[PDB]
Structure formats: structure tokens, C-alpha cells
């Protein structure tokens, strides 16, 4: 299994006197950290959120990011000085394979504008031209370039390998789906709904069936989160009146040990 580690920063600037920055961290679909604007300290959302890092190591990384957050805020407010409101997002982390690839992407007003790539910050084609000078100035600082390079090439994939070991039983958990059927009218026709809730991990197969024949009208919804780190999904089927009889919803999931759930309408 490939895991994508993502550190997400969300920074809002309303005016010269008002801003907030909040961050979350995800390993795959499990949240590992939160960092509220109001908190001086990063909050663990798992028992294993420190990975393999020592207390002193974590204390200093936290301190480093504390200065980053203040520094970032000051620099953006000064960039605006030299139109509110402004929204900035950063998505940084690494995709694991024992290889990996790191990324650091930045969005301005909800649009991707800048990445760090190789040894330098780069604007993406079509980004506003006013970014070129600020980015040139940022690239002149070799110290921060090195810092970002060490963070992406070494600190990220090393941290993540440790998270994978310390969080194994959570990452590899199996939670069984529970399913139920309902319906609503859909024309002068009915829409049957197969609900599947409480499953983990995310991969699942849900299909309306007539015996062994898959009903290709099956319309799978999006994966929706439950609040207990499980997933919800529904699959619908539009059926003509009288053709309801003999239909079933079949669910396959890794937790079920080869025994599919089959509910009959």
C-alpha cells in the first residue's frame, strides 16, 4: 500500500490587523495532527503522532514551525503592503512507495501558483506576474533553500517511515460495513438506495444485482466520512414499477472475510 503524507496549511488574511493560520496533517485518510491558530503547540490526534522522533527532537521541530508560522504571517502582510481578503494554502508532504517523492505546493485565492521543485521555488505557468520578483528574492536565500530541501528530501520520508511503524494497528484496521436499503419515487419509477456505512479501509465494492447479473444502472455516490474514522457510501438504482422484485444489493469489503453482505429488496 502507498501512503500519501500531507501537511495542509490554511492561512486567511482579512486586513492588516487580522489573520489566522490553521494546519492539519493526514497520513492517507487518517488525521495525525492539528494545529490551531490559538494554540502555541501542535496537537496529536493519535497515540502514535510523534512517530519515532524523541521528545527533544519533537520539541525543537515544534519550535521551528512556531517561528515559521509567525514569520510566514509577517512576510505575507508585508507582501500585501508592497487586496484583502487573501487566502493562502500550502500542501506539503510525501508519497511513499522503499522509495518516495516529496511535494510542496502553494495556492493563492484557491488557485495553484507556486511549487518548490529540486532546489528552488518556481511559479507555475499562468500564475500572476507580480509573483516573479518576490519568488526571485526568496530563491536568493540559500539557507532557506537548503532548509526546504532537507525537509522534503530527508525529514519527510524519514518521519513517515516512523509513523507507518508506530501507527500500524490503526493504519491496518478493518471495520465492517453495515448496509441497509431504502427507496424514493423518481418519475411517473423508483430510486432504490443501498447505504453502506462504517467500513474501513476505503476500498469497497457495492452493486445492485439480479441473481449473478450486475445491474449497470448502479450509481455509486462519493465516499463520505463518518466522524469515527470510517466511511459511508450509497449506491442507487432507478427501477421501473414492478421490476423491483428480485433485486439485491451486494457489498464486498476486506473486513468481511470473503462473505459478502447481500440485502434483498
Amino acid at each position: 500500500k502507498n501512503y500519501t503524507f500531507r501537511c495542509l496549511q490554511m492561512s486567511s488574511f482579512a486586513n492588516r490587523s487580522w489573520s489566522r493560520t490553521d494546519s492539519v496533517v493526514w497520513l492517507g485518510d487518517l488525521q495525525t495532527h492539528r494545529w490551531s491558530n490559538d494554540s502555541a503547540t501542535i496537537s496529536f490526534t493519535k497515540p502514535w503522532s510523534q512517530g519515532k522522533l524523541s521528545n527533544q527532537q519533537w520539541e525543537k521541530l515544534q519550535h521551528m514551525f512556531q517561528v515559521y508560522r509567525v514569520s510566514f504571517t509577517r512576510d505575507i502582510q508585508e507582501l500585501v503592503k508592497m487586496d484583502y481578503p487573501i487566502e493562502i494554502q500550502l500542501s506539503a508532504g510525501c508519497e511513499m512507495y522503499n522509495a518516495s517523492e516529496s511535494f510542496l505546493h502553494v495556492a493563492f485565492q484557491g488557485k495553484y501558483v507556486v511549487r518548490f521543485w529540486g532546489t528552488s521555488w518556481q511559479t507555475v505557468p499562468g500564475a500572476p506576474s507580480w509573483l516573479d520578483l518576490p519568488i526571485k528574492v526568496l530563491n536568493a536565500d540559500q539557507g532557506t533553500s537548503a532548509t526546504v530541501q532537507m525537509l522534503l528530501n530527508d525529514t519527510c520520508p524519514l518521519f513517515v517511515r516512523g509513523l507507518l511503524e508506530a501507527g500500524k494497528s490503526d493504519l491496518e484496521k478493518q471495520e465492517k460495513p453495515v448496509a441497509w436499503l431504502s427507496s424514493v419515487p423518481s418519475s411517473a419509477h423508483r430510486q432504490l438506495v443501498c447505504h453502506v456505512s462504517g467500513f474501513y479501509p476505503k476500498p469497497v465494492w457495492v452493486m445492485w444485482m439480479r441473481g449473478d447479473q450486475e445491474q449497470q444502472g448502479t450509481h455509486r455516490g462519493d465516499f463520505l466520512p463518518n466522524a469515527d474514522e470510517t466511511w459511508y457510501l450509497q449506491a442507487t438504482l432507478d427501477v421501473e414499477a414492478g421490476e423491483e422484485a428480485g433485486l439485491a444489493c451486494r457489498v464486498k469489503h476486506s473486513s468481511l472475510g470473503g462473505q459478502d453482505i447481500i440485502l434483498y429488496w
Partner: peptide, 16 residues
Amino acid sequence: EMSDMSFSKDWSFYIL
């Protein structure tokens, strides 16, 4: 109860 706000690959925000 609200989850922490987060955002997707396309940069749009979500919350539960």
C-alpha cells in the same frame, strides 16, 4: 461537533 477544516487535491475546503 465539527471536524477540523481541511482541503482536497483541487484546493476546495471541506468539513464534517
